[PDB]
Amino acid sequence: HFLCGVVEGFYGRPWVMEQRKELFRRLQKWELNTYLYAPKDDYKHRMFWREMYSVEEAEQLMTLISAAREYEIEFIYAISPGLDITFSNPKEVSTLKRKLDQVSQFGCRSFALLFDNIDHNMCAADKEVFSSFAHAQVSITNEIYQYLGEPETFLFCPTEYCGTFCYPNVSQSPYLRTVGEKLLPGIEVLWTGPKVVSKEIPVESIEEVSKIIKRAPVIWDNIHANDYDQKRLFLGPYKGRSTELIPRLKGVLTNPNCEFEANYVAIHTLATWYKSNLYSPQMALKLALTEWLQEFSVTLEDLQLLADLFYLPYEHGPKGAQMLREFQWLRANSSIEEWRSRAAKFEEMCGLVMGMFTRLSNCANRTILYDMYSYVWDIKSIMSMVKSFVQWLGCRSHSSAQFLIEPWAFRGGLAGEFQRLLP
Amino acid sequence: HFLCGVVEGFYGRPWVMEQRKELFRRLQKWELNTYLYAPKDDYKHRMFWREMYSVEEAEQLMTLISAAREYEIEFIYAISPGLDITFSNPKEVSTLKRKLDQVSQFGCRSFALLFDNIDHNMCAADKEVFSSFAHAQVSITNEIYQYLGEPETFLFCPTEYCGTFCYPNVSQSPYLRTVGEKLLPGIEVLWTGPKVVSKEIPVESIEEVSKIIKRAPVIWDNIHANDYDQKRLFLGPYKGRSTELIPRLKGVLTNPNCEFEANYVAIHTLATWYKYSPQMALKLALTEWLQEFGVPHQYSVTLEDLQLLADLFYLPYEHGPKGAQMLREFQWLRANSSVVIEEWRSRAAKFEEMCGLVMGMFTRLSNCANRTILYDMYSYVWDIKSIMSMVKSFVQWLWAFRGGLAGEFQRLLPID
């Protein structure tokens, strides 16, 4: 029973129940099976993990777990005690069970314990009862695994959860060594690629990992995550993941953009590649965008451009990269006559962005507009300044009026000023 | 009477009904009176302005107008049709009245017509019927005024709604002269000052504008508006407007940050000004705000933190002192990295503690019970936190696709 779908596992405003219904309905339209609930800043998941859901909070979770069954999406509930749990103290252990008990009674069969991003050493109390840090986590993870009547799916996210993060390397890591050998065969292990946000997942890297973990690990995929850069959004295709991986993995859960409606392409393209076990990113994209266009006035070309302007954490799209070379060329070669020719076609490429913004803002699906509004606005106003600059470079053989004739000319606020001082 | 309150008048996601109602509570609590409903991207306000409210929308809107009255806050309903409306066509004009009427039966008794940020020239059909651009708008505004029974509050917003937007200057403008002379004595005129986002609104500029429109304007203030930059938020005090503007004005309506919860300082201090020292009003506003951040209740964020937040996200032309200071200190360190007397080590230390306090601010803000406030400010506080972290460690050394595509063009512009 191979696990594929979404983890809502980012920092920030989490999604609301209504968005997660529409999420389930979408996972089913496209044949995915799983949803891991793990949003970092829903306070009871992490910051106040010992605290029980209030009465109305409970009503919400149950109505959520319901619509999960109603759509036959499997619902895994995560908890993150990492920050401040004392592993050796039995009152601590017991609060975790009491909490996991409460959610069990909401309808929840599937569970997860995450331990990403915690201060790597322990308290004075813990360093006695336990040999190493990795000992403590596995002891509690196992203990818990038992208690719940050893549930069907059950995930464990290690502190060392990607290649970069392994000390000193993947292969001969005390932490990783301990996990593979001590942590129960019925417990899955989440893994994130070579890096936190992996450009690509080599088949040799995962085979490598399966070495020390003694399992086919579950991928927490950070490819379309945007919680770490305010300006950034990711409407590109699922890519850099070999089709040959499906055999070798227990699953992939995609950790996608915070803006819910932006995640169409991210989930669709995950879904097409779930099938097929090459697979073609360029084509999956073409499919997703044509199907996506049905929801929205805007042309397919607009969406093609939009996805190109916000593509992937390591790659711009065709039209976006082309605009970049073109402006780079133009700025470089100032002053027989290809410049005027190329500045004219570039001034037109900019206008197509203005066009895409106009059509999006006149569109009928307002939930989609609002989620992306500030992203499209930023790009349009930048191109508009870029266009206006190319004109300035050109109308310069007959003027020496400098490039300013209003605070949207000097961007970024304080953060922007600090950034321009770093190399 | 003099109008002081908020205009929901920005591009982007509009506030929801449960947020607007909360706005009403706070306007009353702080003894403000007015709310101008103008959200640019709430369709049916501008884009599909012709289209009338559904059965369910009608219920929502009415409930809201009720709550305005319940809270002794004047509700002014604005409509922005001037995008593609044909002025002479009576099909459009009758479609306008019918739109206005429908909200009237929602309980609404005050109105506005907005003609801001729209092409200077008309179609040929209207180039016939009307002499200049001004003439066209005045004509239709006046009609809808009478059509509705010449109501107590009626607002009109020019296309030349600020100093720089006037042809060729304010005093001698064709357009302003036609509005001033021919727009009905009972309608009020919106004005944002010298610029779209006026750093100051000096008295003389208001004397200059009042002369040509022959009335005292209503200030649509963009001092705290943040719709125009992804990375900007303004939590500084109402500043740059002399209290002697009040005799010379019919109102100030503030057009504040998009994130609802970030508007606490911006609205509190405008109120404070309405009854002035920006620094003292910030202290008053931050002190009261602190009470809205709790620790969550458990069955198993300080004033200094707020001040650091405000100073980091302050006003559109000025950083708060703590912000400005860190920026000063970092510049001095970066300059004298060659020097590794070593007063530098002593100063790098106090800088690293300053950076420390930014992290601390974020950690505590993320524990607080009021998650509406946390969510609204998250991505801003996160951003400053990540940068100060990298600044801290680069200071100690003595992101290629950062900002995405937009960022990459922005680094090629030279104004940066």
């Binding site: 920092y11 970092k40 990403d116 991003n117 915690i118 201060d119 936190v196 770490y228 | 992290m359 950690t363």
Partner: peptide, 5 residues
């Protein structure tokens, strides 16, 4: 690093 503290 994703995060901490």
């Amino acid at each position: 690093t994703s995060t901490s503290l």
